[PDB]
Structures are given as structure tokens and as C-alpha cells.
Amino acid sequence: NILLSQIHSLSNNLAAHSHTLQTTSIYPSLEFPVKEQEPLLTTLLRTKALPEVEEWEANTLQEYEASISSQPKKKEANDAYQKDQLWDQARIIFMEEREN
Amino acid sequence: ETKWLLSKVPDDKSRFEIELEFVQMLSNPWYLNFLAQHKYFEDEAFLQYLEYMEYWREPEYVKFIIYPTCLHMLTLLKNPQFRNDISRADLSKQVNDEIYYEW
Amino acid sequence: SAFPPPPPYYKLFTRENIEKVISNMEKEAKSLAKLFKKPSCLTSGTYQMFGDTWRLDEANAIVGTSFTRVHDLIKIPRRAYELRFLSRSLMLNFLELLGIMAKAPEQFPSKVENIRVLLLNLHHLINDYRPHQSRESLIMLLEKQLKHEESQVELLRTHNRQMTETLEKYKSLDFNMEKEGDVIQQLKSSIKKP
Amino acid sequence: FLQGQKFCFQNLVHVLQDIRYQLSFARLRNSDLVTALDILSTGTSLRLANAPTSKLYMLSESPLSTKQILQTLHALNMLIRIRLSLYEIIPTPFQHFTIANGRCTFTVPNEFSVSLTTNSQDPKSTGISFQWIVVDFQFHLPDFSSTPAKYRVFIELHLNEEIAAAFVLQKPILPLIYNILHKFCLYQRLNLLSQQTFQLSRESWLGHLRGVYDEKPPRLRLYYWP
Amino acid sequence: DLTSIQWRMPEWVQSMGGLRTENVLEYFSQSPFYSHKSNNEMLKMQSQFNALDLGDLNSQLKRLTGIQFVIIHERPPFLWVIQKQNRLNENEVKPLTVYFVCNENIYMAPNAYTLLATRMLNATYCFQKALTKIEKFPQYNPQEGYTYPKLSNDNLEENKNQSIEPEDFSVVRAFMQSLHSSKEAPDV
Amino acid sequence: DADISSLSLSLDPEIIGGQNNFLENNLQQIFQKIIQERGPFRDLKEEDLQKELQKESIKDESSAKSSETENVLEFATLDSKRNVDSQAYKKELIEQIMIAQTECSLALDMTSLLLSKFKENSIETISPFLKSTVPPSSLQFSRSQPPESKESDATLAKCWKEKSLTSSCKFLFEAKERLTSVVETEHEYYTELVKVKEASWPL
Amino acid sequence: MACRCTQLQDTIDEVATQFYSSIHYLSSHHDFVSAEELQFAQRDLAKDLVTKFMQIDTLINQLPGISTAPKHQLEKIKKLQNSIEEKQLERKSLESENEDLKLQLAKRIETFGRLSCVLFQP
């Protein structure tokens, strides 16, 4: 739950902050040691997640595409906006019954 | 019967050449880490190490030049099982060779 | 260079191929399966001291005399005294340069090429006697081994004479316990006393 | 040379000095191989290899069985009773009968055992049976004796730890250990007896009689009837 | 791909003996990271025309519009800062990635948000994974409470208050305490 | 030349020839080989004598077995590499949380390296090894690029939410199962308590 | 050490570089108003270099393998192996030949260890 508070404030700070962050790019400056200190910072420059988990995301893409193999041509996202929008209205109706 | 046919496009003259030619590239401790991807490690890759066992034998032994390869050979001979083919041992492993280079 | 550094030979390396070879162990009892058998070796860099006579051809005359040595006294006197003569005639060449210079200073330095070409004579026989140096190191190290085995004589023989002579003592022979009789040794030699 | 130039097609790694006078000594070592055989076990030594360094932590391990460790136990079968023939002196009462591990069985009292765990050969000179450890604590006291796990943990631990602390200083050393031995087990006697006093006080028969184990340094008050 | 990955042809450096000034953009020209309609490369095309008219770099570069790889912070003898950019004027600049000499490698500089998202995702993934192959083993009961089934429990082995009206150590704890007091009892 | 085998002593002229004897050598050995516990091993010392007896009687009088040859014997070890709970959940949890959380500590540390360019009340929280090494104000941001975008964004953004809500469904349903079962179990107690209290008994 | 003629070469080509060191004192130090003392330094080189050469000759004097007959010095090694290879297992055979008695003799020391223990407790 406390972690939910953490993800709460963190996701809160993602906000429009990402609007600035997308233009951002890390680089060490003049006081950064040069001889062989770099590679750990290259790991710091390495945005790579868990290779097994990035493999998992690849699995989600390829296997959703396998679902596409089961369903060769079926758009849904356009009316899926009304999926989430029906969530958006039904939540309100839910609140209505709550207030009643 | 047709294991050579399993190759997508290889067969190749192979022979002694690229064997030792890459054995000296095995020598680098810095090379250790990269082997922690998919190119080879504890999977079917292990077979490479298990057939490169012939070097201790006469004739093959002469063409060894950089016993750092023999020390990586010590790594496979040691439980690379452990971190030696996993987490061990950062840039210090190169130092562990550099010391061997120092002495 | 490497193309790229990882081997492209990984499927050759696959375990299950060799597992099929396990099935193949009785195959030719009556593929890569024989390609997992040991590879032909390079001949290959069998060439000798290419930096010798060919370099002498690249010039070597005193070095040619050094070639004559390959049959003080014996071959030595050239190797020593002619070597001195080369070093000292070399000193004379330093007189050839440093002795006169400023008067149109380009000819003598051009003769320095002649000097070092004459200096090419030196190194080769010395590196011919270099393996001989290594042979000397071999002869030196060869019986330090024999020193170690002699140490075994130095100590094992002491254990011999001394542990054997001391095998008989106030304890008499070490076998004086006489096994079962020694069960009485805590009593018949002790408790029996009165 | 030619084979080397053939092997040259690689990334800048090998990996050591470009100089190869030792490799010239390796071709010379091939000449030594012409001078060698026997032996194949010596071929690396003929190659002058398998020992470039060992200071590194790494791992360093090999198969080890079986007679090895047992023969070393025979080496202890000499050394230990050697030190017994030496020093020894004291801390009696005693009737030791060591085999492998140092025997120190008692009577109605309890088990004691010794296990040296340091550097090897220091006889006569420092022959006073110094190094040992609490082994399998297993006290033989009849009223209570079993010794599960946690006892052997926390007790044997700090025992041997402060035994090493005793090594840190000028020697008492063993007799202190010999003290702590009877100390602990007899304290355990104190609360066996105390638990007996509650075998009478907590239940049958009657009350008033007591033997409460005070928090003070140990005492058992056998107060009676009024 | 653009991060911590090898891309090396060392023998070029072996010839050069290392980088100097404009030669960094040579091995960089070998790199994919190098752009073809960069002002470095279209004025490389100028080198294929005017040749002489390029100066050092930045004079010919920044005065002319397009993608560029300008130099600002040297870090001898290894790193050298070289930012990608897009001039829209002889005066105006629209800087891009700081490509940098990672030594026999040069990389685009990662977003902070990328790695941050990596951290967020991996952490919450650890949370969810903690909820994966772990949860629903302590089965709930109003009476028994959470339960922990086993082939063998060992190992080891809002209700009510009023009721009927080990110490695995055999008081061994106090005995050890007494041992602490007693080891120096003669001594103290 | 067996002396070449004795040139190991020459290797001992080139090296210390290992630590050899050690109590620690007897400790890894206390771990290594049969059996365990040096006291219990001492109890086994007579049985160890039995091990030196007929236990080692096995010898060599059989087929060479060419199939075993040669380096493939190691391939059998590879076959071992392939073919061959309380705390443990919490254990692996300590593992994963270690990785992620310490990585986040690196987040705090390197972001501190970035913000150390100005305010000094930020670099202070970095892990102790770092300040001992790299000086603060080292990292610096660059202005660059949108940078890029792909369809995998929206596609995973959809499919993962689908999987999430469905995970909630599986959760609610299987939890419904366990709860219903808890009802099925718990009811017997209070029925027997009908036999108790509804039959008038103390509670 | 060995190949010490190369060590002499260290006093040759490197001494040849020392001549180059001697070279760099006349670039423009004259009319730009010591070099006279530098001539005495030239005398110092006349000492040093030549004496080094004498040293070279002295190490020439004792080239190892003065017989200079590898064709027969290897034969010397052959005879040396005619000794050593015979001595190999022979010297080490003594080890087991000893322990075959002495191990049990040491246990005899242990038996009089029994009796020593008997003496311990009258």
C-alpha cells in the first residue's frame, strides 16, 4: 500500500514533466574521470531493462500478433476508445447508484 | 548422418584455424561479460568449451601463445558454473589477468 | 579482423547435435558427427630465421664471416676480436662524423647510412648463439632437479638410519607391545607389580 | 609467423605483450619437447604453464577423495597425541583417550571434545596443545541430555570465539575453557534443581515450600512452611 | 542499439594512433551515427567539390544550415564531446544528440525518462512479481487464519481476550549470561 | 623424463607450490567428499576404514566402451547441466527487490550527480563508495529530440491493460472460489454450535 | 640472466643513442653568448662509453658454453639425462620404501603412546 503511495506520487511527477524529459539527454561533464571509469556510466546510459523482461515485452508483441494470426483482420482500437469511454461513463453511473 | 546438413549455410573447412584464432580472443576477461547474453553461456554453448578440451594435448599445445587463454581455460576448468561465467568479475578480472600480466 | 568478434559457429556448438552423435556412436560401428572429430592442423609458420641471410641479402660481410663460423680459438676469435674491431672501426666512423661536420654538413650524415649498414653485420650470429645461450640455461636448470632428488637422499636416509636405530630404545622395538600381550602391558607390567 | 598472420585477423586482443621472447622460448620449449617425454602430466610443465598466477580470489577448487582427508586424519593421529606427550599440563581431573578428534569425555558431568584449526607444524615449541575448538557439544549430564541445534549454534560459537580471543593474549588458555565447561552445565544443574523445586511448588504437594530462581547471580531459596 | 554495445574496427585507430581533431569524424563517418545530409557530410560533398573551402569545421558548418556534429568539450585522450545539431540559419542552431567518444564507440545520449521508466517498470514489476508466484499461499480463515500447507511443516512449527482463569533454551540464556560474568569472575 | 614431473618442484622454484596444509583445507574438505561433521566423520573413521577395504574393490576388467570417447564425456556433464516455500518466496523477493531497489538507489545517486551541479543538498544521499570516487556535478543533461515513437507503444498500452483487467477477473473469481470454500468449511463449526448453543451450552 | 651479449647490445645501440645525446649541445649555444665544460663532458663520454666497451669485452670473455658445441653440448645433456632419468623414480622410490615401515613405526610410537598414557595415570 505504501508502495502504492510511491507509485502514486511518482506517476504524479511523470505528468507534464515528461514533456520536458523527452528532450533531455544524459552526459557526464568535465569533472568526470576518464581513464576507465566510463563503462559503469555507460550502464548508467544503458536504459536497458531486464533482458528477460524486454524479451517478455517482445513476447507480448509477437503473441498478440499470434492472436492476430487467430484474428487476421480485426480493428478494435477506434471503438476501444469507447471501450474505455464506456468505462468512463459506467464509472459515473456506478457513482450515481452510490450516491442514491 | 546429415548433421552437417543441419547448417543453414556453413559446413566450412573449419579446421584448426578460427579455433585458436578465437581462443586468443577468449583470453580477455573483459570478453567474459559479453558471453552473458545469448551468443553462448551455459546452454548449448557449453559444448564449445567441452570440445575445446583438446589443447592440453601435444601439437595443439605448441600453438598456444597467451596462457591468459589457458587461464580462461582455468575459468572453464573452474566452476564457471559459478559467477566465473555469470557475475565474475568486473574490470578487476582483467586486473586479475593484468596481475598475471604483471607477473 | 573479427567479423564480428562473436563466433558464427554456434549451431555447430549445439549440444543436441552431439546428443545425436551419441546415437551415432554405434553408427559407423558397422554429417557433423565426424566433424566433431579432431580438425586438421596448420602446417604452417614453419619458416626458420627469415631475418638472417635474407636480411644479409638485404644489405652482412662480417656477418658472412659469421656464417663461415658455422662449421679464443675455433669460431670464437672473430666473434670476439673482430667484434671489437667492428665496434672500434665504428668509433673511427664516429670520428668520420664528429671529426668534421660544418663544412657542407650533409655528406657525412649520408655516410652514417653506410655506418649502420656496416653495423648490420653484428646481430645475427649473436642471435645464432642465443639458442646456445638457451641451451646453457637448460644445462644450468637441468640438475637443480637432481638437487631436489638429492634432498630426498639428504632426508629420507636420515629417517632411515635414525628411525631404525631408534626403533630400538628404552621402549625396545616398536613392536615390543606384541599386540595382545600389550593388553597386559597396562597390567602385567604395572598392576602385576606389588 | 605465417600461421600467426593467419590468426592475426581478429580484434585487438590476445592478450599480453607484443614481445614474444618467451614464445621463442616456447619453440625452444618444443625443442625441449624433443628432449622431453616422459611425461604427459609434465607436458604443461614442459610447456612451463598452468601457474601464471594464483593471488586472485577466483575460485580454486578440484575433486578430492577419498583417502586424502583420512590420511591427514592420521597426521593428526600423530600430531595430537604428540602434543599430549608434550603439553598437556593440565587442567585435571582427566582421563583423555584421543582418537581423531581430541577426546575429553567426563563422568556424570558432560562431553568435551577438541579440534585444532590453525596453521600446522608448531610442536614442542608452542607444543602446549594450543589450538582446538568446541566440536559437537553433547553434554552427558543424566538429568538432561540431547543437544539439538541452537545450543550447538550459540554456545559453541562464542565459546570458540572467546577461545580465539584467548589466543589473542598471553596464554591461560585451555584451563579457562575447562572452567567454562563445568560452569555452564552446572548452572544447568542449578535450574534442573530449580525446576524440581517447582515440581513441588507449582503442583503437588501443597505450596509454601519453594525454590524460586532469583535474577541475581544464581540462588535457590528453599523457604519452607511458616 | 545506440546504447552500451560494441562497434569497433580498432585497426583504423591502430593506423591513426588515436584521434587528433577532425579525424574523430572520420571513424565517426565510419559509424552509422554519422548522417548523410549532415552538414558534415553535405560539406563532405563540398570536400568532393570545393575541398579547400571547409576550414576547421564549425566555421563552414554552423554558418550553413542542416544537421551537424559540432565539437565543444574535449576529454583527452579518450572522450570528446560532439553534439548533433540542426542549423536553421547562419546564426540559428537547433542542437540534437550529444554524440560522444565512448572510445571505439560513439553513442546517442539517452533520455533520463527512459532509464527512469526502466526503473519504475522494473520496480513495480518486482512488486507484481512479488504478487505472482508467492501470493495466495497463506489461505485465509476467520478461524484458522492464514494457512501454510506443507508435505512437512518442519523446518519450524480480532479474536478473544478473556479465557480460562519454551524458552527452547533450558534457561540456557541466563546460563550463558552467567558464563559472561564467570569467565572473568576470577579475573574480576 | 619423470623429472619433468619433478619439475613441478622447479615450478616450486617458480612458485610457492600452493598453501598445501591448512585447517581451512580441512574445512572445505569438511564440506567436500564423504561424509560430513568431523566428529561424526571420526565416528565414521572405522567405517572410513571400511571404505578403504572392500568398498574400493572395484577394478578394471571390462570393455573400453568406445561410445564414451571422448570429449563427449563432458557432454554428459552438459546433460547434467540440463536434465539435472517458506522463506524462499521471501528470499527471492529479497533478490528481486534487491536488484530493483538498489537500481533505484543508483537512480538517486546519479540524479544527485546531476543536481550536484547546483544545490549541494542532494549529492549527500549518494552511496558512500561514489563520493569517495567520482566528484559531484559530473552528469549533465542535453537538449535533444522528440526522440522517437512506435506502434508498439499503443499496442502494448492496450494489451497490457487487457491482461491487467482480466487478471483482476481471475483474481475475483478464484478468490470467490477460496472464499466460498471457506464458507463451506466454517459453516460446520457453527452448526455444531447449533448443537452447542442452540442446545444451551456455555460460550 | 642469459643472452648477456644482448645486455651488451644494451650498451651498444643504446650507447649509440648516447652519441645522439652527445649530439645535442651545439644547436645554437655558441654565438648566443659551459660548452667548454661540455667538452669535458665529451671527455666524460670518452671515459664512459669506452669503458663500457671494455665491459662488453669482459662479458665476451666468458660466453657460456665456451666449448660452443651445441651438437655435442646437447650430447652433454644426453649424458646428464643418462644420470637424471635413471635417478628419477629411484630417489622417489625411497619415499614409499621408507613409509612402508615408518608409518607403522609411527603407530608403534602411538602404542608406546598408549603406554605413555598408562604412565600418565598411576
How far CA F167 is from CA of F157, F158, G63, in Å, comes to: 15, 14, 87
Of D35, D78, D85, the CB nearest to G106: D78
Enumerate the β-bridge partners of residue D128.
D87
Q: Are E68 and E53 in contact (CB under 8 A)?
A: no
Q: What is the largest CA-CA distance in chain G?
A: 107
Q: Which domains does chain B have, with CATH numbers?
A: 5-103 (1.10.10.1340)
Closest CA to D60 of D51, D47, D68: D51
D3, D5, D10 member nearest C1 (Cβ)? D10
* Cα(B67)–Cα(D25) distance, integer angstroms: 14
Gap from A76 CA to chain E (nearest CA, Å): 26
Q: What are the residue ranges of helices labelled H in chain G? A: 4-9, 13-23, 35-60, 70-120
HSE of C131, CA atoms in CB hemisphere, 13 A:
19
Sorted by sequence, the CB contacts under 8 Å of residue B47 that are 6+ apart come out as: C13, C14, C15, C17, C18, F75, F78
> Residue E107: its chain A contacts at CB < 8 A?
42, 45
What is d(CA A49, CA D222) in angstroms, rounded to the nearest whole number?
71
- Amino acid D101 reads N
| Minimum CA–CA partner of G52 in chain C | C87
- Cα dihedral A51, A56, A57, A61, rounded to 10, equals 130
Map residue E156 onto helix, strand or coil: coil
Please check whether residue C8 touches D, CB under 8 A: no
Distance CA C60, CA C53 (A): 8
Neighbours of B, requiring at least 3 CB pairs below 8 Å, are A, C, D, F
Between CA D128 and CA D85 the distance in angstroms is 10
Cross-strand partners of D101? D99
CB F75 to CB B50 under 8 A? yes
- Method used experimentally: cryo-EM
Query: Which set of grid coordinates corresponds to residue C108?
Result: 657525412
Q: What are φ and ψ of residue F118, in 5° steps? A: -125, -90
How distant, in Å, are the alpha carbons of E161, F181, F198 from that of F186?
21, 8, 17
Q: Which residue of F has its CA nearest to E135?
A: F89
| Burial group, residue C125, by CB count within 10 angstroms (0-12, 13-18, 19+) | buried
Q: What is the distance between the alpha carbons of residues D159 and C120, in angstroms, rounded to a whole number?
A: 77
Cβ neighbours of residue D130 under 8 Å, at least 6 residues apart?
D116, D118, D122, D167, D171, D173
Q: Tell me if residue D213 falls in helix, strand or coil.
A: strand
What secondary structure does DSSP assign to D65-122, as a single string? -SHHHHHHHHHHHHHHHHHHHHB-----S-----BSBEE---SSS---EE---S-S--
Size of interface D-G (CB pairs under 8 A): 18
CB G77 within 8 A of CB C142: yes
Inter-chain contacts counted by CB atoms under 8 A, chains E and F: 66
